[PDB]
Amino acid sequence: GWQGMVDGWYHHSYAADKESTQKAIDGVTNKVNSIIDKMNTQFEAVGREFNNLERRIENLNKKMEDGFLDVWTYNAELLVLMENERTLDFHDSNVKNLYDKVRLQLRDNAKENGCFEFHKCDNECMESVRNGTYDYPQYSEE
Amino acid sequence: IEGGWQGMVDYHHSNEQGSDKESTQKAIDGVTNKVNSIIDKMNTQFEAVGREFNNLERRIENLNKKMEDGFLDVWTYNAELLVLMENERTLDFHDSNVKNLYDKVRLQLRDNAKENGCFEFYHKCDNECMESVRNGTYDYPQYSEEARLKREE
Amino acid sequence: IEGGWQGMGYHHSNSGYAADKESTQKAIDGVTNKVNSIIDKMNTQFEAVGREFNNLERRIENLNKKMEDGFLDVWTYNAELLVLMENERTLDFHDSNVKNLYDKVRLQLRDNAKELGNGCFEFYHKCDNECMESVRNGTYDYPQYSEEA
Amino acid sequence: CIGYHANNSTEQVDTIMEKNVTVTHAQDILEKKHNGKLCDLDGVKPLILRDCSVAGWLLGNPMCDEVPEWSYIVEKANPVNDLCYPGDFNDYEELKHLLSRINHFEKIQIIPKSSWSASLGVSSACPYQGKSSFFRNVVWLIKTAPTIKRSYNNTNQEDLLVLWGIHHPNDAAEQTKLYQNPTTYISVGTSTLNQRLVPRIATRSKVNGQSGRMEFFWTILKPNDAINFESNGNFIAPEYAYKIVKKGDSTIMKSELEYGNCNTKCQTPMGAINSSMPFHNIHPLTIGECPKYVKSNRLVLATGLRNS
Amino acid sequence: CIGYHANNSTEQVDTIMEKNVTVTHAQDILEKKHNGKLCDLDGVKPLILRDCSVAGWLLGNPMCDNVPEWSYIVEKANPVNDLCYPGDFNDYEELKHLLSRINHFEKIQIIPKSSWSASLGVSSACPYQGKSSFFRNVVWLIKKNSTAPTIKRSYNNTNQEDLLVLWGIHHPNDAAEQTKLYQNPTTYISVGTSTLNQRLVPRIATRSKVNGQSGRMEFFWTILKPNDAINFESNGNFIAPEYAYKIVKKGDSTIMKSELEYGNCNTKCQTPMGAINSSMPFHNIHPLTIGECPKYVKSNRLVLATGLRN
Amino acid sequence: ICIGYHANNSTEQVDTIMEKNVTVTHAQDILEKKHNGKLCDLDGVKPLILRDCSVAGWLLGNPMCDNVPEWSYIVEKANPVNDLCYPGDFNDYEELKHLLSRINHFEKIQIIPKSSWSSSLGVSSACPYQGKSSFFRNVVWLIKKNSTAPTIKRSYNNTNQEDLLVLWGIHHPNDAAEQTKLYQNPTTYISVGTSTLNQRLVPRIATRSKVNGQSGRMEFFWTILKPNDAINFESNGNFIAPEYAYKIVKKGDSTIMKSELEYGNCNTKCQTPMGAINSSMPFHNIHPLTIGECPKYVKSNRLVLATGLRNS
Ligand SMILES: *[C@@H]1O[C@H](CO)[C@@H](O[C@@H]2O[C@H](CO)[C@@H](O[C@@H]3O[C@H](CO)[C@@H](O)[C@H](O)[C@@H]3O)[C@H](O)[C@H]2NC(C)=O)[C@H](O)[C@H]1NC(C)=O
Ligand SMILES: O=C(CO)N[C@H]1[C@H]([C@H](O)[C@H](O)CO)O[C@@](O[C@@H]2[C@@H](O)[C@H](O)O[C@H](CO)[C@@H]2O)(C(=O)O)C[C@@H]1O
Ligand SMILES: *[C@@H]1O[C@H](CO)[C@@H](O[C@@H]2O[C@H](CO)[C@@H](O)[C@H](O)[C@H]2NC(C)=O)[C@H](O)[C@H]1NC(C)=O
Ligand SMILES: *[C@@H]1O[C@H](CO)[C@@H](O[C@@H]2O[C@H](CO)[C@@H](O)[C@H](O)[C@H]2NC(C)=O)[C@H](O)[C@H]1NC(C)=O
Ligand SMILES: *[C@@H]1O[C@H](CO)[C@@H](O)[C@H](O)[C@H]1NC(C)=O
Ligand SMILES: *[C@@H]1O[C@H](CO)[C@@H](O)[C@H](O)[C@H]1NC(C)=O
């Protein structure tokens, strides 16, 4: 993809799509927000308060301390790995969804690299492509 | 296809004469399977109790507290996430099947119509011609010439 | 694609089957890292489970029951649904891989063939066996057979 | 034209990337409702103590009322009738957890008041009908104080729970007053049990108008074992015992509610739960098969599509 | 054309089907940082004992040094000043757990040292100012002159809070040595309460010298309700209480083991390696935490992909 | 030219969060269900197994019970028939077993011989060695000598390099009349002292039912003698004195296992009373009472993932 595009996350024959970038930045921010905020934190005290003649209960506390570490680590690791592809495949869709958004917009006014060669088309003609307000019958016969 | 149509309670046909359970039943059995599995795959449940420790056993009382609070933190966090995960994975399945069905008509009729998720034919298509669009048995070579001549106008 | 290729990729009528090595080994390397990461990310740290409480220690014995049964429910439920959640991710990834290889061929030959409906293209020109490497390799030349279409 | 459904729905779900998605149809899996009364647990009535503790009910507390099978026990948060004569109960929390779920329970006279003939004793801390009484199920022995030797063999088919006690007077005078020997012992013998109780005289504060104490003990007499007693004088001897069949475990439930003729799978001190749902948020102190307790209010799945 | 973003990104993420995929922007949800010093807990400073144990600080050990409130207790791994005179403590771990979090704590003299003139004692194992002494907060009752009379003393609680009483018994070395200290060979201690009823008898046994001491001393405790009275009675071998402790109990905590020392700060999660100031959901700092803390996880990197692949 | 997916002769089926009984090209299960049905070593450390004896009966010298210097866990069968040949109790018996669950060095030591205690010795018919009655081999029962039993004062000082476990006991006679027959003094004590321990035992006379033909009981106690501390015994007459002790080395903990199988020459990282487990899988459904680095116990029969594409 393009490296010089800092406007956001089109190219003219750059200006990033302000709509899909706003829908993406707001959405992925909400996913990290829900991952952190859904956690429930309560006051707990850990201190190993059993003497050497209470070692059986000391082992019972171990089995639950060690048991919870096994559960959280497996969930946290797999949640990271599962949501990362769902994020990296979420970006595989936005390109083709923005491609078809413009492809189905101008139907026969150009020829299909994710690029289109158009009738010649100016700045006001391509800023209308980004807006979603592209007038097809204005350049239909050409 | 913005907003979706409201009048569909059972496609919408554009025709001079008048104004889909194949993919719906597949989605009805598919999403209901997800809700049933969320309830039924955790069907394993045993007995539970309360609290039975006196004033000189408050260390063990804090041990039972640590695991109860530790379990509530687990079940709450996973269930809240499972809702959020399976709610979007449900909604994404709707937008997924739409293009699968939108392309189905686009694949079926090609040059006999022009591409909002709507189509209007180059030829005339009556109330019985739209049988073949719903059934999947559309005769493309039949309306070939009728689309060719009315295309060069 | 109603019928699967029972006899096998690509299939041509010129006629034989030839699987795509670039797309298959990429997907095999991806799923192998999935099953591995499911098994490898599990942490085990040597716990010894046994009933060691006497008759007058049933309450502490009952407390161990709640945590033994409690962890059983977390692991049983999460394992059953992780299978269900990751099985769907795979079968949708296979439907995702059919289209991603289909669009690579469809965007390769633009106006030089015709989409039938079975996932096949009938060329507007004649394409021989050395011509169909261009479609498979990714080295397909559009302007050569352009006017023939 | 192709499109998706939409109706006049107000149901909302939450997407992991979107908050407040208006949805066609939604289903909730978080149980939030209860019927608000104690019920049976898998078709078995609970043992509900009105104003009595497990001690005052097991013993013969005169202020306590006199069911052979129960799934769990319910006692008020602070029962009023514990021990009319103040004292302790050895391994009381283990005795309660043992009786929490019982398959068979039967009160049996093993050695009656007539076989205790030393005299019987009463104090005013246990009022029954305007006249000072004592525990129904045990007997207070008072003197010349002689040595008492009597054993009971378990001839029944089931396990037997025997209860006995010892009196700890206030001063050395209250002992000689009632128990002639200044030095006293109580020896209980079983194939398992081997103990010997000596009274502990100490100046204590008044509880229910009594400075003395009474400490109770118990074992499970195996169905063909014999229990043997030998005491010098400070003996609170058993008159009744309880046969027990133990098939499962439960807990003692704390709630101020009363019984209703209902049945449920999950019990809660705020009301029973009839739910196949996987989660609930009612109360943590649950008994029986229950959904997982959760600190949340909304667990709504999206069964339909997004609306305009 | 239609394209996507790219920048000068070096951070890598892992995903379920690919390993090490360079990504535009990334964020870690695993907290690995700690300030390395002890702080308060939700606004309350903790009770720190540098070289003294909870038993050595509760009793009047001369090797030890009055804060009325604390969120949790910190004592080093093995404080150097436990019981200067060797012995044990009854329900010591539950008493430590009871005092782990106290809302109000105040030492109170209940029966003065003068009110037991039986005589007093002083062992060389508990040095005060070079000249040996005993515990400050409790009094060792010995016999006096020719005979060992019986002691009957009873303290009634008149405060509005629960108060903690501490007393003990001395276990002599030999039977002939007890006759020296306490004229009667048969001895007892009777502690009476509406709740408590105990009677202690000394166990004469040959033991190894700890701090130059073959004899031991065993301590006990209860909590006296605001309008209840505790009553002692002894024939000797009695370690009597001089001070008490009014207690206001509002919550629970635990005893943290850390050699670190205090810093004037505040935190929500405490760790023997230093407090934590994190809003993250996971951490890999230490298993023994106090306060509302994230979940402990055995991993080094839990990085999500916030941007697209570069 | 066409584009499509694979299909072969396979009936392996998996389930999906939206579909069920899907016919798949290839499948793989991640739930461990197989066990070799025999006890093995843990990370290369043999287990301590008792055929018909208990830990108490083996620790003491029960004549029916039979040496190993290192083990990972302890196996005693459901109900051992050779417990306490002379009936009684064991103080902190549950805590003591958890200590001996994993021992890196175990070496029996005679600290105070049988002859030294004589100055005689007691035998019961409840502990028959070979028809002719004997007693525990590791602890000695003391009876009056020359019709008058005086105070016995014998102390042992640990001079070894490791902690060592001392065992002693007290006899509770049936009636007070039998005591005078065995021990001249009617009132009796047993004082045991270390820098750690302080206790004084008193006989507890009570009429009891016969167990193994004996109604008198014998209660046992134990401590761990630190390397340079000494233990001092002083008893009036009811003494069951220590003759043998055990040096111990503690570098890890385990649990006591209940199984009827006995040793097979195998190795494992995870053990089960039904047989060990060889597993890279993170889950299993064998047994809950596991020992070792084990997969997580799960209630399921099939946890099969999909390794191939869906087949028609
Ligand atoms: C511990 O000390 C407290 C403080 O004196 C003692 O409490 C008091 O006991 C006396 C007599 O038992 C109570 O006397 C009365 O007041 C009521 C009206 O409330 C009146 O009807 C009576 O005639 C009498 O004057 C006093 O109220 C009570 N104080 C409190 C705060 O309860 C207590 O008895 C001492 N504990 C022991 C066991 O020594
Ligand atoms: O008399 C008092 C009152 O403070 N203390 C003496 C104590 C006390 O008698 C014992 O602890 C009772 O068991 O004993 C001291 O005695 C030891 C002595 O036993 C030993 O054999 O030698 C030591 C020095 O080597 C001490 O003297 C003690 O300091 O604890 C002396 C006290 O005066
Ligand atoms: C308790 O009652 C049982 C029932 O009679 C007694 O058990 C019997 O003991 C005799 C002799 O030991 C045997 O011959 C019988 O077969 C036993 N009966 C049963 C049902 O086992 C037992 O002896 C009594 N206990 C005591 C000590 O009196
Ligand atoms: C137990 O035996 C050891 C070895 O003799 C004793 O330890 C020694 O004590 C003497 C005199 O107190 C010292 O000279 C040695 O240096 C000590 N050795 C060590 C390694 O410290 C010990 O005192 C005896 N224990 C008891 C309780 O008597
Ligand atoms: C969504 O709506 C609910 C109630 O309508 C409200 O609690 C919440 O704050 C809303 N979210 C946003 C982001 O507005
Ligand atoms: C799936 O197949 C298995 C055996 O083939 C059978 O037990 C089960 O009932 C089947 N499920 C359905 C829904 O047919």
Provide residues of B within 8 Å CB-CB of chain E. 56-59, 62, 73
E165 and E244 Cβ atoms separated by less than 8 Å: yes
User: Which domain covers residue B146, as residue numbers?
Assistant: 1-153
* Residues E49 and E180 reside in one and the same domain: yes
d(CA E189, CA E194): 17
* Residue E227 CA, ligand 1 centroid: distance in Å: 8
Closest ligand 3 atom to Cα of D155? 2
Distant-in-sequence, close-in-space partners of B21: CB < 8 Å, separation ≥ 6: B10
**Which of F296, F293, F272, F268 shows the shortest CA–CA distance to F282?**
F296
d(CA D133, CA D52): 17
* Residues F61 and F1 reside in one and the same domain: no
DSSP for B40-101, please give it.
Answer: HTT------------GGGHHHHHHHHHHHHHHHHHHHHHHHHHHHHHHHHHHHHHHHHHHHH
Distant-in-sequence, close-in-space partners of D302: CB < 8 Å, separation ≥ 6: B86, B87, B90, B91, D13, D15, D21, D23, D26
**Which of A44, A34, A42, A17 shows the shortest CA–CA distance to A79?**
A34
Total count of domains within chain E: 2
Question: Helix or strand or coil: residue E257?
Answer: strand
* Residues E37 and E90 reside in one and the same domain: no
Identify all chain B residues contacting D279, using CB atoms and an 8 Å cutoff. 75, 79
Of all residues in chain C, the one with the smallest CA distance to D192 is C55
Of F239, F261, F283, the one marking the end of a domain is F261
d(CA B22, CA D2): 14
Q: Does D63 touch chain C (CB under 8 A)?
A: no
Looking at the DSSP bridge assignments, the partners of residue F76 are: F50
CA distances from A99 to A129, C136, D18, F273, F292 (A): 11, 24, 23, 62, 55
Compute, in degrees rounded to 10, the torsion defined by CA atoms B78, B83, B86, B87: -160
Distant-in-sequence, close-in-space partners of D143: CB < 8 Å, separation ≥ 6: D118, D119, D178, D179, D180, D233
E193 and E228 Cβ atoms separated by less than 8 Å: yes
Of all residues in chain B, the one with the smallest CA distance to F303 is B41
Distant-in-sequence, close-in-space partners of E155: CB < 8 Å, separation ≥ 6: E110, E111, E165, E229, E230
Cα E37–Cα E42–Cα E43 angle in degrees, nearest 5: 85
CA distances from B45 to A106, B56, D101, E181, F47 (A): 58, 32, 19, 64, 35
d(CA D33, CA D272): 9
- The interaxial angle of helices A55-103 and C21-40, nearest 10 deg, is 150
Closest ligand 1 atom to Cα of E156? 1
Number of neighbours of residue E5 by Cβ within 10 angstroms: 23
* Beta strand ranges found along E91-161 (DSSP E): 104-109, 123-129, 131-133, 138-141, 151-156
Q: Check D292 against B71: CB less than 8 A apart.
A: yes
- Tell me, using a 6 A CB cutoff, whether residue D292 lines ligand 5: no
Count CA atoms closer than 13 A to E28's CA, side-chain side.
13
Structure tokens at D88: 């302790």
Q: Does C32 touch chain A (CB under 8 A)?
A: no
Determine the residue type at F109: I
- Backbone breaks in chain F (C–N > 2.5 Å) follow which residues? 66, 119
Residue F171's φ and ψ, nearest 5 degrees, are -100, 130
**Per-residue b or e along D160-184, where b marks 16 or more CB atoms closer than 10 Å to that residue's CB:** bbbbbbbbbbbeeeebeebbebeeb
Q: How far is CA D306 from the centre of its chain?
A: 53
**Which of E161, E178, E205, E201 shows the shortest CA–CA distance to E68?**
E161
Q: Does C91 touch chain A (CB under 8 A)?
A: no
Q: How many CB pairs under 8 A join C and F?
A: 161
Handedness of CA E200, E201, E205, E209 (dihedral sign): positive
Distant-in-sequence, close-in-space partners of A126: CB < 8 Å, separation ≥ 6: A10, A12, A15
d(CA C123, CA C126): 6
CA distances from E23 to C29, E12, F198 (A): 20, 6, 67
Rg (CA), chain D: 28
* Residues D26 and D147 reside in one and the same domain: no
* Residues D85 and D3 reside in one and the same domain: no
Kindly report the CATH number assigned to the domain that includes residue D272: 2.10.77.10
Structure tokens at A33: 């927000």
Question: Helix or strand or coil: residue C93?
Answer: helix
* Residue D304 CA, ligand 5 centroid: distance in Å: 20
Question: Helix or strand or coil: residue C57?
Answer: helix
* Residues D167 and D237 reside in one and the same domain: yes
- Tell me, using a 6 A CB cutoff, whether residue F19 lines ligand 6: no
Question: Helix or strand or coil: residue D195?
Answer: strand
Of A71, A82, A111, the CB nearest to C110: A111
Rg (CA), chain C: 27
Ligand 3 atom 3 nearest Cα: D224
Structure tokens at D116: 């205790």
Q: Check D16 against A28: CB less than 8 A apart.
A: no
Closest ligand 6 atom to Cα of F21? 1
Count CA atoms closer than 13 A to E254's CA, side-chain side.
25
d(CA F105, CA F248): 6
Place of tokens 């949805």: D23
Total count of domains within chain B: 1
- Tell me, using a 6 A CB cutoff, whether residue F230 lines ligand 4: yes
**Which of B136, B140, B97, B124 shows the shortest CA–CA distance to B17?**
B124
d(CA D302, CA E4): 31
* Residues F154 and F272 reside in one and the same domain: no
D77 and D102 Cβ atoms separated by less than 8 Å: no
Q: Check A30 against D16: CB less than 8 A apart.
A: yes
User: Which domain covers residue E154, as residue numbers?
Assistant: 45-260
CA distances from C146 to C111, C112, C125, C126, C130 (A): 8, 6, 9, 12, 17
Burial class, B38, CB count within 10 angstroms (exposed 0-12 / middle 13-18 / buried 19+): buried
Place of tokens 């609306």: D307
β pairing state of D240-245 and D159-168: antiparallel
Of F95, F282, F296, the CB nearest to A55: F95
Kindly report the CATH number assigned to the domain that includes residue C122: 3.90.20.10
* Residues D137 and D61 reside in one and the same domain: yes
**3-class DSSP string for F148-198:** CCCCEEEEEECCCCCEEEEEEEEEECCCHHHHHHHCCCCCCCEEEECCCCE
Q: Does C38 touch chain B (CB under 8 A)?
A: no
Q: Check F205 against D189: CB less than 8 A apart.
A: no
* Residue D20 CA, ligand 5 centroid: distance in Å: 6
CA distances from B116 to A100, B99, B126, E221, F290 (A): 12, 12, 21, 82, 61
Q: Check B67 against C62: CB less than 8 A apart.
A: no
**Structural element, H or E, at residue C128:** none
β pairing state of D138-142 and D235-238: antiparallel
* Residues F27 and F106 reside in one and the same domain: no
- Tell me, using a 6 A CB cutoff, whether residue D297 lines ligand 5: no
Q: Check B87 against D21: CB less than 8 A apart.
A: yes
Structure tokens at F11: 């009936």
d(CA F164, CA F107): 9
- The interaxial angle of helices C58-106 and A55-103, nearest 10 deg, is 20
F230 and F156 Cβ atoms separated by less than 8 Å: yes
- Tell me, using a 6 A CB cutoff, whether residue E86 lines ligand 2: no
**Per-residue b or e along F36-62, where b marks 16 or more CB atoms closer than 10 Å to that residue's CB:** eebbbbbeeebbbbbeebbbbbbbbbb
Q: How far is CA D117 from the centre of its chain?
A: 33
Structure tokens at E121: 């004692």
Q: How far is CA C63 from the centre of its chain?
A: 44
Q: Check F204 against D188: CB less than 8 A apart.
A: no
d(CA C75, CA B92): 28
Q: Check A42 against B73: CB less than 8 A apart.
A: yes
E150 and E232 Cβ atoms separated by less than 8 Å: no
D279 and B39 Cβ atoms separated by less than 8 Å: no
* Residues F15 and F146 reside in one and the same domain: no
d(CA E72, CA E41): 8
F227 and F123 Cβ atoms separated by less than 8 Å: no
Looking at the DSSP bridge assignments, the partners of residue A99 are: none
Number of neighbours of residue E152 by Cβ within 10 angstroms: 11
β pairing state of F230-235 and F190-193: antiparallel
Distant-in-sequence, close-in-space partners of A99: CB < 8 Å, separation ≥ 6: A114, E2
* Residue D224 CA, ligand 3 centroid: distance in Å: 6
**Which of D139, D108, D107, D136 shows the shortest CA–CA distance to D121?**
D139
Distant-in-sequence, close-in-space partners of B66: CB < 8 Å, separation ≥ 6: A44, A46, A61, A64, A65
Measure in Å the smallest separation between the Cα of F177 and chain D Cα atoms: 15
DSSP for D197-253, please give it.
Answer: E---------BTTB--EEEEEEEEE-TT-EEEEEESS-EEEESEEEEEE------EE
* Residue E210 CA, ligand 4 centroid: distance in Å: 12
Of all residues in chain F, the one with the smallest CA distance to B46 is F299
Cα C63–Cα C66–Cα C67 angle in degrees, nearest 5: 95
Identify all chain C residues contacting D292, using CB atoms and an 8 Å cutoff. 73
Structure tokens at C120: 């096949």
Measure in Å the smallest separation between the Cα of F207 and chain D Cα atoms: 5
d(CA A86, CA F124): 76
Measure in Å the smallest separation between the Cα of A136 and chain E Cα atoms: 18
F294 and F24 Cβ atoms separated by less than 8 Å: no
**Which of E306, E266, E302 shows the shortest CA–CA distance to E44?**
E266
Looking at the DSSP bridge assignments, the partners of residue F232 are: F155, F193
Identify all chain C residues contacting A73, using CB atoms and an 8 Å cutoff. 41, 43
**Which of F192, F183, F90, F113 shows the shortest CA–CA distance to F145?**
F183
Residue C65's φ and ψ, nearest 5 degrees, are -65, -45
* Residues E77 and E124 reside in one and the same domain: yes
d(CA E5, CA E7): 7
Rg (CA), chain A: 27
- Tell me, using a 6 A CB cutoff, whether residue D19 lines ligand 5: yes
Ligand 6 atom 3 nearest Cα: F21
Q: Name the experimental technique.
A: X-ray
* Residues F63 and F34 reside in one and the same domain: no
End-to-end CA distance of chain F: 21
Q: Which region holds residue F59: left if phi is over 0, alpha if psi is between -120 and 50, else beta?
A: alpha
**Which of F173, F201, F197 shows the shortest CA–CA distance to F188?**
F201
Stated in angstroms to one decimal place, the resolution of this structure is 3.3
The number of the ligand nearest the C-alpha atom of E209 reads 4
Of E86, E204, E216, the CB nearest to F191: E204
